[PDB]
Symmetry: C3
Subunit: 142 residues, 3 copies
């Protein structure tokens, strides 16, 4: 399969697949300063057209917190297939838990493609007729 990738400009550092990386690292399109308890969209400088039928998912690197002090407010980002216009540039929504700086080209998150869920009819029912599982720690911790 092919992903069509359009960079914001000639100064973006191209993204790349590496051997031991199952997902592909994305990079801050510019220097970004964030304060403790402050929010900021970090631009990733990339617009993409994914193969037919695929969405993309975006998560932090596991070193993102150590190196950059931020977490991703939407936890795992969902890039909709339809987000493929010439101006639909990808972003990483960041919340700083400490004062931090990010540099241009810094690998701060990673992505992969995956097939969209199938089409599914929503059948409204009065009663489900299954026994309750329960949740929220119903199985304990020990």
């Amino acid at each position: 399969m092919q992903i069509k990738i359009k960079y914001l400009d000639e100064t973006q550092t191209r993204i790349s697949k590496i051997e031991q990386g199952d997902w592909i690292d994305l990079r801050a399109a510019e220097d970004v300063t964030i304060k403790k308890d402050e929010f900021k969209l970090v631009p990733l400088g990339v617009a993409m057209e994914l193969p037919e039928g695929y969405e993309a998912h975006v998560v932090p690197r596991s070193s993102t917190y150590k190196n950059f002090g931020v977490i991703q407010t939407n936890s795992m980002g969902v890039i909709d297939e339809s987000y493929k216009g010439d101006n639909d540039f990808w972003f990483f929504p960041a919340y700083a838990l400490r004062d931090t700086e990010i540099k241009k080209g810094d690998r701060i998150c990673q992505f992969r493609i995956m097939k969209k869920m199938p089409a599914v009819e929503l059948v409204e029912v009065e009663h489900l007729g299954n026994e309750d599982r329960g949740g929220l720690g119903s199985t304990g911790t020990k």
Copy 2:
């Protein structure tokens, strides 16, 4: 395929598939108020029986933090296939990063379904026999 959905009551807004959303938006089942640094189960007012062999995942919308100042504490919720009882209503577990108010019907997160992982045998070994990859930023930042 079909999902059977049971709404908590007749005042819940029905969830809906939109053409530019690969995931489906879920909605607060009642008004919720949350103070900075407090936790609240935001009830989503729906219980579901998913197609056989599937689980679901629930993540925030990208605008959730902006519009509502919350994060999802479990990051990506996993709705187990067995949580298909008549009382197994879904919830979004929110930590507030600021005083916030959520209204009944507000689209605060999104879901999709996916095949469960296959049945796996867990084979204990004394030695894995492979070279170490290392981790936690072993590949650097640049």
Copy 3:
């Protein structure tokens, strides 16, 4: 399918598939204390070789926060297929929101395996030629 699992030592409680659990719970390899607003890598006392072509994903349990007052800094951990060396032990990167103790053997997160994304050719293009979707809450909230 088979997963080869190597425990850190003979005192680790063995992990298991439970009926109502679509993912499998992972456990703390030792007692860990974390003060509010501290970070700590919680060791899970396991290394694994996954079936050929698979990665694994690691997220918290819904009850992780209720029971242990932590969130997962990288939101959803991606365990690369290559991370299968004899010293490649899994970890849960935890940030404490309140003062907590995590006890040895406690089930603090869950994992599953998944087919990696297939091989993708990155095709550099100057214009994507599609209509802009927009994002970051473009569909509103109501």
